[PDB]
Predict the structure of CGMP-dependent protein kinase.
Amino acid sequence: SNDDFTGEDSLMEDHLELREKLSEDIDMIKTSLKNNLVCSTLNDNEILTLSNYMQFFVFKSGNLVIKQGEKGSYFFIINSGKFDVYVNDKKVKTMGKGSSFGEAALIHNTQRSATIIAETDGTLWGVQRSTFRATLKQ
Ligand SMILES: Nc1nc2c(ncn2[C@@H]2O[C@@H]3COP(=O)(O)O[C@H]3[C@H]2O)c(=O)[nH]1
């Protein structure tokens, strides 16, 4: 019970903003999914399904998105802003709009392998693990 509201589902819920997707949002989600090295083999219907279940998440500078060693619950596409990747406390890259992340824990069914921080204010499209894994499990 002490652990019920710790974890990605609780954290991301706190960053959710209800939003109608605009044409440019749909377009960018589709191109970004064609660009993830796990989703590059998805067909257009699989992409459309993922896109339908994407939600909008808003972050301020220095907010944590993913923490290395935790259970993963989401796959993300960067919509705006800059997100840094840290592997064992060393920053390995900075990602911007169109990049995606969070697939590895979900595919391998393992802990998050890096920490991702909003370096600037930024926004993400995120889909829950259930939909993501189901789309790949075929
Ligand atoms: N481990 C690792 N993850 C990275 C790297 N660059 C981007 N990532 C992403 O950071 C994510 C952290 O959560 P996941 O392990 O689910 O998936 C990881 C990748 O999508 C990298 O160089 N190493």
